């Protein structure tokens, strides 16, 4: 009946997952970069 | 009408993921603060 809103909702849920995964890859790089700056100090 | 329950569960999974990302991010924001402060 309201299938078309459910279809946009699952699409959005996919859009949001993908964006969190891209942010995760970027977050990981900053954690890594911070660790090298820490080791330079130590 | 059975698919609603996997949407709500997925929304709970994403929220939980974004909350764990926020801990990590708060941690890196604080780490950056301490490196800036050593410079100053």
């Amino acid at each position: 009946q309201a299938r078309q809103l459910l279809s946009g909702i699952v699409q959005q849920q996919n859009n949001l997952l993908r964006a969190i995964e891209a942010q995760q890859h970027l977050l990981q790089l900053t954690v890594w970069g911070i660790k090298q700056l820490q080791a330079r100090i130590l | 009408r059975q698919l609603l329950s996997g949407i709500v569960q997925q929304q709970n999974n994403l929220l939980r993921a974004i909350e764990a990302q926020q801990h990590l991010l708060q941690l890196t924001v604080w780490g950056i603060k301490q490196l800036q402060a050593r410079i100053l």
Partner: peptide
Amino acid sequence: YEQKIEELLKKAEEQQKKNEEELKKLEK
């Protein structure tokens, strides 16, 4: 923290597949 995030995102992908195959049963 990173291991945890990986686990929740793991879970999210599979629930996403389950959601989409079910929306397919409802015809797209």
